[PDB]
Design a protein around this ligand. Structure first.
Ligand SMILES: CC(C)(COP(=O)(O)OP(=O)(O)OC[C@H]1O[C@@H](n2cnc3c(N)ncnc32)[C@H](O)[C@@H]1OP(=O)(O)O)[C@@H](O)C(=O)NCCC(=O)NCCS
Ligand SMILES: CC(C)(COP(=O)(O)OP(=O)(O)OC[C@H]1O[C@@H](n2cnc3c(N)ncnc32)[C@H](O)[C@@H]1OP(=O)(O)O)[C@@H](O)C(=O)NCCC(=O)NCCS
Ligand SMILES: CC(C)(COP(=O)(O)OP(=O)(O)OC[C@H]1O[C@@H](n2cnc3c(N)ncnc32)[C@H](O)[C@@H]1OP(=O)(O)O)[C@@H](O)C(=O)NCCC(=O)NCCS
Ligand SMILES: CC(C)(COP(=O)(O)OP(=O)(O)OC[C@H]1O[C@@H](n2cnc3c(N)ncnc32)[C@H](O)[C@@H]1OP(=O)(O)O)[C@@H](O)C(=O)NCCC(=O)NCCS
Lengths: 394, 394, 394, 394
């Protein structure tokens, strides 16, 4: 059978706004920071890592094509450790954790790091006609960030597919704005109570007034009221719209990682771990309805884990859009109180490549806060996919 | 225990030159072409695939961040099938096959496609300052292609690391120029004898004189002689150089894929498969000496396989540079007559993201040609890694 | 002999900061605004213009290569009127007035408009390798604004040539900072007293809070003290520097124009004019010492006008850098109280293409304010030239 | 009265094709080459020039904003000589000669150089959003070359205005294709008989096979036949088109200049001059019908000269398009045998900024060949203008 996978430690950066506090920090620099910190938290030497896998979507510079390896080397991992970068769009952060856990499951490693890093502020523009020239006539600089946010089959913004899901699953504008407001209020309460303090790695963000610590998710609106969302206009469709900038996730920069070990290696070392991996699952859906990808994925994961929806104490389902997050919770029969108890993409931000690993850290630290047992981590994926994993607090 | 993985079908495109026959075919276009073909050759319904994994390094357009999912859908694979894009630099092609095989080993799927697709001719230029502006002073147009060919730690071209490998392991200029010539002559013989016909998928390359079929690797030199390589000057160092444009691999475009099944699912379908997966391994090395990555990876793969170097009847060890290929064969004690019997990167080309899956097709089709048992597939990886897999003809 | 040239009317925009209030107004849009306004002020029909000449240096868009014609047509001038764009770097605004006055002098026209328009905020970046491609290796986006500010022979910033002039003519740092401070104080007093109100054409600058009138030169610092300039560091040389951002002119956007007529046409119409043209002169100097170009140019103009330095009641000599503005006033023996009585480039800004015509408007309105008789307008020119003109209040 | 202006010397480069022999020679390079030559041919010290004026439209690099001053200095003209760059679109070349002649007419100088220089192959692409950023969404790479060929009011290609001129003045496709063929045959005859030898300055164009002299206009078709033009399709309109790539001028690179002196200064130096300036004129017309600009300009020039159309022994009327050239000759009543006797824009090419000074050299050298008296030089101007000058052989 497959070896049991133990998550011993995890960390994330605070989530920077588009063009915000982390705009000057490359994805490989952010990746290396979290790599070094999860090693310290796990009490694991950099020379004892079997594998490193990182999620990452939008290459910002040539270094990013070496992202996992640069994060590992510059994070203190010995050069004998293999490093892999994976891209499953917004599921990449969780895919990296799954892929790294697979090396432990199959016996290829006893220690593996899974994380994700993304800086969308530094997303580049490309010039397709630069290498061989344009000769005559205007050309274009292609926004690679917005291009990533476009379905590659119908060439529509991800927000259009959110309208398809809202229309198909009866998600009203009022319901979307209700989730968006509650998300900000939840994240604001978490920040005020310090629920993220232990899981966040402060970053010193060199300013002209001196070095200041960036350690709080800056997308959150702490004074949000219902009218703040009702006044906004739809942004992705010109007719019968419901998805606004207020009930859509943000564009952000961040990194996160977890350190995993085989159960035997965790016993022998005597670590006090966060959680163990129970199961994971994938799913594909209609690209035009990608927002409900988490629904099947989550159903297969519960089947694999032999669990039910009522057994989930904590649920981290990324709020890409309130339109799809409502449909996901509605289709699975989840309790909105247990789903994203401290906010999510709408309030804290959506650093696409790192989100999957970022909200895994959130789920595991929330289990420790409430003494819960099981946590579900799931998110939708552009192109029409879903990914889900279940962890057990131990 | 882990499930046994069977390779039932495989195919590759002809390798196009930089700015050559496939310059107008995007990576997703090439990816879908090979996805549909592996399904046909294996006689597998697109509704019966459990996972698709594609290796790919240099994003040429937004669509490329969805490459695996676009190649699958447009290749005829149902939308319920998950799709993953992996980046392990030049090992990406073989990593995609490994990652796909792992879904079968772990019981997450009983059918999986693994391949790679790269079009370096379409490699873009980026403008890091385009999003938020430059304000004042000249900015740069970054060559993402050349940037991908630079070690991210010392910012040196991969050819510089090839010189380090030559100096450390005593590979002479005459030794490099010998392998380069032979590689070209082995490929010319292979194309003359038609050894590549079955494994290659032709592509109609819409010319102004009518449609013509591109089905022959165009980087080969059929009239090569020893003088053809001696006259060239070193390219990557100003002093005591040995790597030239002739003894170094080319910059090429191509795609390839293989369809794999569980041993039970292949038994149940009556498919006549190519080979079965014996073992795989990864390794990390000094980034400055990334060229000898295949050595520890090949040794580890043989340990897992319980085999020796002398049991390998076919070896596809990518000729990234003659400097490192000679050292690889040298340090492993391989028979050069069994290594790259029909050429490799120097002669056929190096479509980095697709090479790993491309030479796997070669190795398996060569095993059927000579009636052999075991084949090794290995290649070096920028940043200091190596990957290796062993297959058994059946 | 040559016909006498009468300046009947003139106007300028307020001077916008780099990336400031006029950043959204193209050079042709600003040019057309002033063209229409000088026609109204002169009581001249757009169908009665013999010639239009505009100064302009940095093309921001294709339209700018048609600048004079677009400003004329869109300004209300009939299509039967010829339009010319001239480029003498920072002397272009005054060159346009000279060139237009020449058509009257030679009898080719009885009515001509001379002005200048420049928006340096909208200065573009070029891609020299875009048309025919780069193939491989990084390229560059060329800052055309900074390129304009570089001597084309030694490829040094204009500020380096200002250091050459300060060194050769004994202009201390303290003296440069003394002129810079006094310039801001003079411009602030002029703004507070309303000396520019009549000569400025307000522009409604569409903001999200509503439409607000832009009618005040926004580069001026109204609370400047001596320490504000002493604390600044040299900006153009690494050793023995004196030229700072504080004692150097600004980079700005603006437009200006004057309407001129033959003396006979002015008599017949019965206009109440601003001034008449007395003489003009050009000069070339060492490019490395371009800052003292005004010295000879001004000497030849006084010779042509048969006047002396003591006969000048008003002097508008552009403050490109305090380094050269001090040397100019020192070499000519001018009274600093009569030179730039209401500030200049350092405080009000330097919209290079429009500056020449802009400060002509300033000089003529200042003559009316003090009841003076003669005004000198001169400025230095990158590449090593000077230009000067003398007007008489009538 | 006004002083008499004498043309003592002139020279032009061979006209290079778009991306042809002069693609590597910047406009300032070509400008300096012709400046030095006119000085030599006239035997005038570079210390004795009073003004330099150059026409130039499309800035290819920062240096081009200094074009007149760079061509002068690097051409051997002393640094005390002022230098001016003028832009009247395709009339820039003749405008530079007019502006230079005006310095002599007004007594500001007794020696002046007037020319033009354009390299459209090096015409750049701009990024208007590069300075302050795009933030989100695709931006454009603006073709400054094609943009310069667009009317700035209706944003239509100049060829569209040629269709308007053809429709309004009844110029048939067969009439346009006839002028195009003849223009090519006249040029071929001129090159065969060596008519251009004296007036052309050869340029060694550093090739990989050794240096070769580029001294022959390369846009001409020496084997042209009526069928060569009938087979081409209209290029600028989808319906009822008549302007083709064959009957329209080309996109070319070249430079030219002339050295002029006051009649008294030429008398005092014993120079044997080419011709003297009789008169010049400007005109404005409907931008949509800019092609007939030469008609009112030529009529006005003849009035000032006190001459008739029948006194003109040579006419260089630029063939911007056969559609407008036919109408120009038609509305003026000119003898097509006297118009462009050795070809023009269609056959020889159209280096827009240099054309005006280029065909002036042609007209004067043709007057010496046929022993004639009066020559007319005229051309249309984008945006709706025309310029014309008359010279007298002496
Ligand atoms: C929706 C989207 C296009 C908005 O882009 P944006 O304009 O840059 O968003 P911003 O927050 O910077 O500003 C939007 C405006 O709404 C306002 N706004 C946003 N959220 C608000 C809130 N909760 N309350 C009140 N106002 C709000 C902003 O203040 C801002 O107003 P301003 O311009 O006057 O300052 C972008 O955020 C987006 O695409 N999000 C989803 C991305 C995605 O596809 N993720 C993955 C999908 S699987
Ligand atoms: C080496 C490299 C820089 C050469 O770039 P290139 O100039 O575009 O290569 P080209 O084949 O187009 O031209 C090189 C010249 O050598 C010549 N040449 C190359 N191979 C030759 C041969 N076997 N015999 C004779 N001449 C040869 C070419 O004809 C060409 O000459 P030409 O310009 O007169 O036509 C590039 O191919 C490279 O980077 N290779 C290694 C890439 C890499 O890092 N792969 C991954 C490493 S793990
Ligand atoms: C000198 C130059 C390079 C400065 O560029 P800049 O950095 O964009 O100038 P800015 O005003 O935007 O900012 C410079 C800094 O000096 C400070 N500064 C400028 N003038 C100041 C003053 N009078 N008092 C106090 N501080 C001042 C600014 O506040 C700013 O500080 P900050 O960054 O903390 O906000 C540029 O203005 C220049 O080149 N000027 C001359 C151009 C020229 O060649 N003209 C034609 C020559 S013939
Ligand atoms: C008309 C125009 C758009 C053509 O652009 P182009 O495609 O680059 O021109 P090219 O000569 O390179 O190619 C055109 C095609 O027609 C053909 N052609 C052109 N002239 C021909 C002739 N006299 N006989 C036969 N064929 C001819 C070319 O061979 C070429 O065919 P190919 O591609 O198979 O080789 C461009 O030249 C133009 O804009 N001309 C007018 C410019 C202008 O506005 N000047 C100022 C106006 S005041």
């Amino acid at each position: 059978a497959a070896k049991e996978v133990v998550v011993v430690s995890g960390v994330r950066t605070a989530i920077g706004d588009f063009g915000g506090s982390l705009k000057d920090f490359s994805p490989t620099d952010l990746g290396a920071k979290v790599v070094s910190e999860v090693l310290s938290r796990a009490n694991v030497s950099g020379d004892a890592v079997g594998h490193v896998v990182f999620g990452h979507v939008v290459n910002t510079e040539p270094k990013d094509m070496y992202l996992a390896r640069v994060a590992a080397i510059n994070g203190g991992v010995a050069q004998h450790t293999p490093a892999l970068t994976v891209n499953r769009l917004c599921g990449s952060g969780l895919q990296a954790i799954v892929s790294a856990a697979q090396t432990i499951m199959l016996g290829d490693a006893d220690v593996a790091i899974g994380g994700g890093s993304e800086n969308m502020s530094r997303a580049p523009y490309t010039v397709p006609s630069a290498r061989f020239g344009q000769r005559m006539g205007d050309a274009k600089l292609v926004d690679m960030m917005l291009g990533a946010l476009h379905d590659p089959f119908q060439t529509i913004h991800m927000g259009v597919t959110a309208e398809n899901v809202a229309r198909k699953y009866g998600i009203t504008r009022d319901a979307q704005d209700a989730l968006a407001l509650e998300s900000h209020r939840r994240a604001a309460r978490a920040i005020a109570e310090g629920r993220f303090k232990d899981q966040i790695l402060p970053i010193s963000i060199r300013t002209k007034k001196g070095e200041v610590a960036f350690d709080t998710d800056e997308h959150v609106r702490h004074d949000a009221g219902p009218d703040d969302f009702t006044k906004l206009k739809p942004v992705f469709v010109k007719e019968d719209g419901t998805v606004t900038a207020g009930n859509a996730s943000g564009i952000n920069d961040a990194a996160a990682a977890v350190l995993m070990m085989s159960a035997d290696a965790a016993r022998a070392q005597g670590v006090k771990p966060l959680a163990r991996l129970v199961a994971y699952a994938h799913a594909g859906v209609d690209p035009a309805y990608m927002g409900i990808g988490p629904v099947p994925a989550t159903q297969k994961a519960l089947e694999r884990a032999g669990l039910k929806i009522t057994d989930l104490d904590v649920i981290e389902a990324n709020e890409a859009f309130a339109a799809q997050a409502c449909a996901v919770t509605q289709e699975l029969g989840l309790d909105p109180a247990k789903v994203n108890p401290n906010g999510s993409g709408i309030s804290l931000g959506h650093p696409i490549g790192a989100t999957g690993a970022l909200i895994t850290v959130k789920a595991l630290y929330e289990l420790k806060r409430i003494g819960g047992r099981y946590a579900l981590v799931t998110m939708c994926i552009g192109g029409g996919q879903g990914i889900a994993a279940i962890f057990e607090n131990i």
